[model samples]
Target chain A: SLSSEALMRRAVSLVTDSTSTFLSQTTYALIEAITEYTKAVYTLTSLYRQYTSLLGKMNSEEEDEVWQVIIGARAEMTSKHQEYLKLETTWMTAVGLSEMAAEAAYQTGADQASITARNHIQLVKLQVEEVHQLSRKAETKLAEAQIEELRQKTQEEGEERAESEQEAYLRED
Target chain B: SLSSEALMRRAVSLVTDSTSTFLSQTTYALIEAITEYTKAVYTLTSLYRQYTSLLGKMNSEEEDEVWQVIIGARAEMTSKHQEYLKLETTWMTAVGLSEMAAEAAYQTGADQASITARNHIQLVKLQVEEVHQLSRKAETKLAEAQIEELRQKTQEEGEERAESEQEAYLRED
Candidate 1:
């Protein structure tokens, strides 16, 4: 007639419930943001690789096709870049919001476990912000490099059509 | 007689070299830290799942084997927890160090690209730190929940030997 059975159930729920609750509340949005952002990054990087490969196949025989593909790829990359930036902004906002929530919880004189959890939540938010910052910088470098490449390529081409085509692409939509 | 060929090569190198340098300098260590930390977390979660399964098999006839596995799994989980904590610490330190380095570079009247890269690097560092904070909180809640479960189980069992066995496991090394 021991209550050991009930006790075991309690133990099981102890770990399981907290895990479930914590994941649902503190992590779900962050995870969703990261997952979506990561997918977008993958698409952008894949486009970048394709762009690089197309650049290599540029030749006199395929000049028309090559430029067409390159220009199209650049446009596509630009669109994707904008999409990524938006997602990045969403991610940053979500992180900041999460941190604010955690800190609010902390200020409430939460239990030790909650306090501890809040503290770490804060840490993760801070870390994510740092990552975002570096990522932005890297992107800026990439953007500058790309523009510089295009400028040099245009000068080298010395073709009015070449300048016009690239200029149109670079123009504000 | 256009130098388009040379210009194209320059364009390619401009993008490639910066990408290579940025990755090697700013991201390698942080990526390493994250990879190791992720693997360790996977291990810990796996052990946790195994522990839960073994706990389910606890019965009068399977007491000895179940307890044996349960205890062993807990010990393994604890060891992994310590490892994860160390890795987490390392990750935090790495992020901070990267941020500091980026700030230093930023102060050196660097080019616009370098300055932009540094700024973004700093953001990423901050984001990661926030993530770490939340993770630590989640872990603490988990730890407390587990301990609470065990305490309840011991009390429910109400067997001197049961208490003794669990006590031994909980004892300081």
Candidate 2:
């Protein structure tokens, strides 16, 4: 059985875990996905700029400058591609790390929740057994002196006695 | 009811529209998502630096400095939570727009594909009809005079006969 103090502590702990899990699990992904879209936007923006630049050259009817802008965009794109390749190696490593982190976070939540669950499950069983012991001592053909001894039993002794009665309870039904 | 020439142009046009629609619709969202994540990483990295800087207080092992670190983290977290609220609103708007954009892209792809579908559907039907007519003309009974006319069908009389055939083929039939 849990005390009121322990119950309040458990509830408070749960609230804290909820916030931490949200921060660790959900927020960063939202941030990453948003950033991904931003990068995509800038790439398109650059391409659009390159196109309009070439169109400007076309308006002026300059063959060389039109070719120049094409070459310029190509050269920059080649350099950006190289940078992207490097970033891929570096950031892909981080990506793998994050996947591991997410799994670790998942395991942590499951572990904590399961520990609380198993502990709580046993708590109810033990408390009910205590109540069943009290009821049996009251209803069974026990002397007034015996009831006094049962009332005076230590919690540990009571627990042991209650456990012993579990066999009798199960044997009948 | 499209001509082969028109169908070809429509297909080519759709291929071109595919890129423009992508530029207008989905790619920007991806880029924006990436940018948001990058910004969030930066903010976190800076916070980490600040946290470490306060390790001087840890050099003395004062409980106050430890407390400072905790409260600092809390304060920064609260501020971030506030910023996230604003970001949530802004990006949520973008998210809705992207959903619409993606749908728009879907519609664009579907519309263009449907045009190809209908045109191509009619294309073979009309071609087979013309071939069937040519076959009938070949096999159907004709006079010897008609056979003489067939030999000279490529000449001036032929052109006039074709002009007349155009009317006969289109009208009444």
Candidate 3:
């Protein structure tokens, strides 16, 4: 016959284990989220400098050099966007899954502290996401304006360029 | 002649009130923390560019201009440090006090979610503090090296500057 005490202790242990697991996974995911935010900050800062440098060349007779830098910046931004999409997708999934794990633990009667900690983590994520959105908007504005200006300049100068070819380069790979 | 149900309901309400208070304060503090971090990044970035611009003036016979910019950068950094000291003191106290509030709520038998959220807020604070420390160290190194180099150059030029006067100028107000 199974002792009722043994069953009660096992149940408590199972709940405790799930709570611990949720916390462990959440802690790791939050670290990853912060790293992604920091990298985005640095990347945006560097891109701003690069884009501003391009505009400074506006007064120079270096159309060819300017176009080369513009193309390079566009390609760089495109690659960064691709990389960011992959990273953001992974990060979002990881955090979402960890929160789900937290929910499961809570459903299993885990302590209030564990769930409160998970809530706090989500708040931190909110701050980072807000910053990320701001940065993306800014970069998009700067990159779009500069690239469009360059394209217009090329057309006005009567360059032998195909509209389809230019559009293809501007689009994603 | 206290009714047990009424007394129990009141006790639970008190704990809930405190938990909500703790979270409200923490949410505001975390937002402030993130703003501080973003400001630090921008300040440090601007200071680096200014200091590097000073060094780039080294090869030319523009010692006077170099010295002026160096002094200006130092003054700006000093001001930022003062402002940061004030901001940091307030932020640290606010976060610490909010955690204390959380603890009080927990002791009063508040639900676990509030405490978990408090823990997460602390984690975010840790990240921001780490970044602030890094930015301070970097700015310190750049500012000290450039200022010292300029002082040495001034001495070599035999401008008849008094040691006491120069030292006083270098020291904080």
Candidate 4:
């Protein structure tokens, strides 16, 4: 019942319509998720950095109190990081599901336009995932670095205490 | 005429639809930009730390080459940090515009919803800006520390060279 040109025109129209709808919807969701995720990531990194900076400012004997503060701050940061991860996972899953839906919607008579639109969405989703992964990895590395710094500070405090006691014994002699 | 309950429901529906659409598109864009900016910050910090570690590893005569490397690295890092600042500014602007668009789509009666959403987006944007500023400040402090370390290393090198020359002259007696 459908002529070749007519069918092609219809296909193009459907693709154009779907592309506009998908692009607009996808952009909105991506931005919102990114905004929330960025906030969480920034907070986590800032607090971790602040805790380390505070540790650096303390004297050797003052390290125990600093470590206590660091532990509390680290706990809060880790919880926030986890929340961001969950949001990222959900966003990626939605991207996949949406792509599948678009593919199904275009399955009649091989609509190239719809296919192209869906492909673009998929590509953007992949890029977003890559960025999220990189950010998460960097956060993990920062957390490890903070732990190492804390350990070193504790060791230095012990050494300083021992040296002070030795000086007192020598002076008494 | 629409009843108040119906109007409220319609407004809620519009917000839900608009929010979903906006988040899908911009989330990935913002995430990608923020990730790039954060990576630059991490790279500069890591390189600065490396420069300091190298100084501690070197003897007096070998220090000149290390200083040259440190200076070159510092210039490269500063350029990258500037690039990050530019990207973050663009990202924050995009976030603000998107939030405004979302708020405008909400009905007059849903003013509280619009205000809350706008405020939340603004808060996130502010936090991101703060993180960007913190990164710049940290970079500046680290650069200054590197410069001081280089100066100390150079002074030690000069002292060692002078002592070696004097010993050679005395050996002639």
Mind giving the per-residue lDDT tens digits that candidate 3 earns over B1-173?
Answer: 12422332233333233333333333344344435444554554455455445553355556455556656655655665665554454345334434533443343233354465476656657665665666666657656655665665566444444655687788786
Off by over 4 Å in 4: A1-43, A56-82, A160-173, B1-173
Score candidate 1 by TM-score against the native: 0.30
> Against the hidden true structure, what lDDT does model 1 obtain?
0.44
List of clashing residue pairs for candidate 3? A112-B112, A113-B112, A116-B113, A116-B116, A116-B117, A117-B116, A117-B117
Question: Looking at model 1 chain B, which ten-residue stretch has the lowest summed lDDT?
Answer: B1-10
lDDT of 2 at B64: 53
Better of 1 and 4 by TM-score: 4
Tens digits of per-residue lDDT, candidate 4, A41-107, equal 5555565555555554465455566566667666655665565444444344334434433442353
TM-score of 3: 0.31
> lDDT-based ranking, best first?
4, 3, 1, 2
Best by TM-score: 4
Of 3 and 4, the candidate ranking higher by TM-score: 4
Tens-place lDDT per residue, model 1, B1-173, is: 02422332232233222322332332333344444454454445454444444443256456556556556656655665565454444344333433333332232222343355555555656665565555565466556656655665565556766776988999784
Please give, as one word, the docking class of candidate 2.
incorrect
lDDT of 4 by residue, B6-75 (tens): 4433443344344433332233333444455455545555655555556543674545565566566656
Could you tell me every candidate's TM-score relative to the true structure?
Answer: 0.30, 0.18, 0.31, 0.36
In candidate 1, which residue ranges exceed 4 Å CA deviation?
A: A1-173, B1-67, B70-97, B111-115, B130-134, B159-173
* TM-score: the better of candidates 2 and 4: 4
Which regions of candidate 2 deviate over 4 angstroms?
A: A1-173, B56-173
